[PDB]
Symmetry: C3
Subunit: 116 residues, 3 copies
Amino acid sequence: MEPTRIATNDRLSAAVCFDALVFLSGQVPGQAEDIHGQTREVLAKIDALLAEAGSRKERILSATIYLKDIARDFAALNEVWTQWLPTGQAPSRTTVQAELARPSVLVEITVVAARG
Amino acid sequence: MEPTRIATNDRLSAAVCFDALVFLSGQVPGQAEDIHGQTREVLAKIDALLAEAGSRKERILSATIYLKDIARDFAALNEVWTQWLPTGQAPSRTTVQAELARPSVLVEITVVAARG
Amino acid sequence: MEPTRIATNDRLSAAVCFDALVFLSGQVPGQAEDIHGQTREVLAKIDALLAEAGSRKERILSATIYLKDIARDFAALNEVWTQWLPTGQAPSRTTVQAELARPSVLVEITVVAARG
């Protein structure tokens, strides 16, 4: 059995599927400049990739959430994140501070999920 | 087959199980203020979650260890970590610096393990 | 079924295998002092561990890439990384800034892959 890939470029594939597992690349925001908007955009991008890969939000296994400024933005992150999640079905998660590839990026989230 | 969850709140589940895999949320210390005590507390919390999820320390697959100050606390981390591990059965691991959600938190560890 | 380990010391195993999955410890450079050389060395070390564990570069599922200085070294990282990858077969990846265990280490990469 072989890995399959979704949205491949020279650096990464947006998703790699292997058996019943889905590995997503860290997703970054769209055009939003603020933390709330950026978190919404990251999570929307994750939701679409889960769909494309045969998974869904209820089948997320783990999320690592990277914040440029964890002290400043943790509460906003949690607000948007908890809304977006399916009720009673939150995944494992780890939230830490790390600078991302562009200084305007405030949040990036990496998800592993189960195929349905 | 569906993921199952242990200790779910609005943001996360302490553990998510899927087939033979166990994904733990990043664990943070208890009341300790010092690095040695905090590392002990994080590892004790991991040990209990592994038990609850049908795993054990000998079945850890990977650990990512986050230190607020890696230069300052790496040696203390390693001292406590190597004691806690089952002899000859260390997992894959990655240790990096990252600020955690509270400034008093010096160490946080995220584990993936195999069900028994 | 039990995890098996490659290159175990008191802190970590370079690789842990479990069923069809391979979990590698974060790999650090060899003797290089510059970002290009260091990235080459990290990736060479990963390639050997994949071989030892029954995998290969075409079966990488995820990579988390840690840069001491992401603003400064992202472009060099990408240059070496894209060369090293098998054409059209890039994995999922996440690239973030984090200080590593030694200040001279500029880059560290943690890989999960599929057994062949």
